[PDB]
Amino acid sequence: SDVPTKLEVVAATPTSLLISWDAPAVTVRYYRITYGETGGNSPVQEFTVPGSKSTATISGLKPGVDYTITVYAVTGLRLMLAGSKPISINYRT
Amino acid sequence: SDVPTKLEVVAATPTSLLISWDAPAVTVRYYRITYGETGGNSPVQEFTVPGSKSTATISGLKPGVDYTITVYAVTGLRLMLAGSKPISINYRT
Amino acid sequence: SLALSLTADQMVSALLDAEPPILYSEYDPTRPFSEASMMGLLTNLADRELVHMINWAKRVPGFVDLTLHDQVHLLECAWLEILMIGLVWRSMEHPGKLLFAPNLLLDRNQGKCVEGMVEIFDMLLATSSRFRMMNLQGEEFVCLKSIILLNSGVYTKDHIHRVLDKITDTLIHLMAKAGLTLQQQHQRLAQLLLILSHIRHMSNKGMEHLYSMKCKNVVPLSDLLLEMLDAHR
Amino acid sequence: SLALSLTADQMVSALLDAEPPILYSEYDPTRPFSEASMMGLLTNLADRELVHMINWAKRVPGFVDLTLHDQVHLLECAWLEILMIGLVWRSMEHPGKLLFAPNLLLDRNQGKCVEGMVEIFDMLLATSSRFRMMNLQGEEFVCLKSIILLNSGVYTKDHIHRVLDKITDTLIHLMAKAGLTLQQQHQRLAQLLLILSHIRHMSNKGMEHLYSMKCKNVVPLSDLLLEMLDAHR
Ligand SMILES: C[C@]12CC[C@@H]3c4ccc(O)cc4CC[C@H]3[C@@H]1CC[C@@H]2O
Numbered sequence: 001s002d003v004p005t006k007l008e009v010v011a012a013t014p015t016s017l018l019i020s021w022d023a024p025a026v027t028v029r030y031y032r033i034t035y036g037e038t039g040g041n042s043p044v045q046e047f048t049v050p051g052s053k054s055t056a057t058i059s060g061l062k063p064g065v066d067y068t069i070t071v072y073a074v075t076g077l078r079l080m081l082a083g084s085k086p087i088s089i090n091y092r093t
Numbered sequence: 094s095d096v097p098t099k100l101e102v103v104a105a106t107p108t109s110l111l112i113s114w115d116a117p118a119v120t121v122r123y124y125r126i127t128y129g130e131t132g133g134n135s136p137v138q139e140f141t142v143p144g145s146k147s148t149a150t151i152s153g154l155k156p157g158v159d160y161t162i163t164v165y166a167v168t169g170l171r172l173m174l175a176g177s178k179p180i181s182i183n184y185r186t
Numbered sequence: 187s188l189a190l191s192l193t194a195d196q197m198v199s200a201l202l203d204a205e206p207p208i209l210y211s212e213y214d215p216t217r218p219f220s221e222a223s224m225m226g227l228l229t230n231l232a233d234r235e236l237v238h239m240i241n242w243a244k245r246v247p248g249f250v251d252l253t254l255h256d257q258v259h260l261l262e263c264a265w266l267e268i269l270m271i272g273l274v275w276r277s278m279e280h281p282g283k284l285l286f287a288p289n290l291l292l293d294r295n296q297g298k299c300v301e302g303m304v305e306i307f308d309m310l311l312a313t314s315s316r317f318r319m320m321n322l323q324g325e326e327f328v329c330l331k332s333i334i335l336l337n338s339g340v341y342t343k344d345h346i347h348r349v350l351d352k353i354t355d356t357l358i359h360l361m362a363k364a365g366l367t368l369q370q371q372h373q374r375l376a377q378l379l380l381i382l383s384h385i386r387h388m389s390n391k392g393m394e395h396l397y398s399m400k401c402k403n404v405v406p407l408s409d410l411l412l413e414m415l416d417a418h419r
Numbered sequence: 420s421l422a423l424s425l426t427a428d429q430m431v432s433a434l435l436d437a438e439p440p441i442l443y444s445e446y447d448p449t450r451p452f453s454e455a456s457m458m459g460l461l462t463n464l465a466d467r468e469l470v471h472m473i474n475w476a477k478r479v480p481g482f483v484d485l486t487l488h489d490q491v492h493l494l495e496c497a498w499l500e501i502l503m504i505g506l507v508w509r510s511m512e513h514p515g516k517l518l519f520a521p522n523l524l525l526d527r528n529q530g531k532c533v534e535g536m537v538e539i540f541d542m543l544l545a546t547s548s549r550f551r552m553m554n555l556q557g558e559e560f561v562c563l564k565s566i567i568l569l570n571s572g573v574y575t576k577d578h579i580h581r582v583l584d585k586i587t588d589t590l591i592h593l594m595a596k597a598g599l600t601l602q603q604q605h606q607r608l609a610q611l612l613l614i615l616s617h618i619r620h621m622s623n624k625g626m627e628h629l630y631s632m633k634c635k636n637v638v639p640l641s642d643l644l645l646e647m648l649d650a651h652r
């Protein structure tokens with residue numbers, strides 16, 4: 001591939017999520033992870049992960065709630081434009 | 094006064110004009126003189142004279158033609174705005 | 187083409203759905219406001235938003251139908267204008283302050299922490315107020331955004347120019363639908379388009395500010411923002 | 420007020436009469452084109468035009484009814500935009516080149532004598548062509564000029580805002596009078612106002628260029644221009 005794929009939740013506590021994805025075959029400057037309570041509609045949180053990594057923890061989630069998680073691969077303007085819709089998933093904590 | 098006045102033609106040859114005006118009572122950065130054949134409608138010529146001066150020669154005019162001469166006092170944006178319409182005259186060479 | 191078959195109602199619905207997500211800033215109150223820290227804060231927010239700006243753009247009708255070269259160009263040109271028009275929208279209901287984000291409500295003095303900032307702030311405020319004062323509606327706003335994206339730059343592109351005249355018709359349709367007379371219609375149309383000028387201007391002043399901050403080397407900027415800036419000189 | 424009682428025909432006639440005089444440049448062909456000499460040439464022309472810009476402005480309806488402070492502000496803001504829109508008008512019938520003056524017809528390579536110039540030239544050209552391509556009429560043009568003068572800047576002025584909506588009505592009246600349909604009318608209105616954005620932008624880029632040229636100390640600039648520039652930082 002050429003953009004991140006196979007995003008999924010590896011482990012989980014009531015308050016934390018550890019996630020992983022299969023990196024794209026490309027220099028990735030870094031990633032952005034965004035999460036938010038699913039269809040809650042509020043602003044989402046976002047944080048950055050170094051491009052050599054391909055997993056991230058998410059913490060301080062409200063136990064038993066359903067979050068939407070989305071992983072953004074930050075490359076360059078051109079690739080990002082050319083690139084596909086980012087992969088996202090839903091996971092209830 | 095506070096802007097140039099008493100503009101007039103002192104001397105004249107077939108091709109040159111010497112003009113003078115009564116300076117305003119103010120630091121004048123410099124003046125601009127413009128001249129053009131009267132109601133000929135073409136672009137006008139323009140040249141600059143140091144503000145300590147209060148006369149100027151105009152040369153290379155077509156003999157026997159009627160010119161319009163206008164003297165612009167360059168001060169500052171504010172004065173120039175506040176100031177009056179510039180004084181002009183007509184003189185046939 | 188498809189962006190041309192869309193009725194105004196359809197056109198507006200599309201843009202309304204393509205809206206980027208609202209973002210929290212990285213504001214932290216244990217660390218006090220320094221020139222370094224606030225620029226880092228604003229500058230971090232900007233990098234964030236840019237990532238969504240890209241995917242928002244693609245969703246703007248007819249945009250993804252341009253050559254990738256043009257899609258790039260429009261964004262290198264428009265990003266700060268886009269950023270700004272959004273801030274100014276977001277701040278309309280806050281006479282006096284700028285709602286950079288749900289957790290970042292700055293007002294005018296907070297801006298003169300950073301040298302050069304306050305002048306741009308004053309304008310962002312003025313513009314904000316002006317929109318509030320003419321009751322800009324969310325439906326007009328998304329149109330404005332798009333026009334801003336599509337209108338950035340220069341000629342060497344008549345594709346771009348049709349989908350703009352579309353957006354114009356949409357605009358005019360809204361007003362009509364909102365109970366204006368023909369003369370009030372064109373008048374308000376003109377009023378909004380004149381504002382776009384002020385944003386180009388704010389955008390230019392900001393961009394230079396941002397650039398001077400990069401050199402002075404106050405704060406470090408992320409790879410993406412960094413590109414969007416260097417795209418300009 | 421008086422600028423409001425004027426019918427469109429009256430409004431257009433006034434602006435058409437207030438036109439500044441056409442100026443020769445100080446071009447001399449015994450001395451070859453250096454970066455120094457061409458910047459001095461352009462920069463000298465600019466100082467000249469500015470003196471007439473001032474007295475042209477006063478003649479723009481309702482302008483002289485503003486506080487002198489506002490008359491100043493509008494001009495410190497607008498002068499290069501005004502300068503540019505004029506150049507771009509003046510160049511319409513010269514695909515490829517810029518008619519800075521009756522004795523100065525520059526084209527694109529002549530501009531890359533001066534570093535930084537060519538980029539702005541390319542835009543001045545693009546804009547020029549765009550006007551020619553939509554057959555901008557002298558009557559629309561003087562309106563544009565005025566809007567540019569009146570629209571420059573920011574809010575803290577509803578006087579200014581009425582005499583603009585006047586100019587808008589005038590604009591719309593022209594098109595009507597010229598045989599357009601309602602939809603072609605608003606469309607063309609929008610097209611012109613969008614262009615004003617490009618000029619703000621060209622104006623900003625120029626102003627910075629001009630400023631960098633002052634420092635590098637290539638050419639010396641006259642007291643008046645010098646003020647109009649420093650008015651900006
Ligand atoms: C680009 C600047 C930092 C990022 C700022 C920002 C950051 C986020 C956002 O949504 C809007 C804006 C507009 C103003 C921008 C600023 C103006 C000057 C400063 O350099």
Ligand SMILES: C[C@]12CC[C@@H]3c4ccc(O)cc4CC[C@H]3[C@@H]1CC[C@@H]2O
Nearest residue numbers: 461462464465502503506625628629
């Ligand atoms: C201001 C510059 C010199 C004067 C130029 C001028 C000079 C006279 C004029 O009528 C128009 C223009 C527009 C472009 C201006 C130039 C753009 C950059 C340069 O510094």
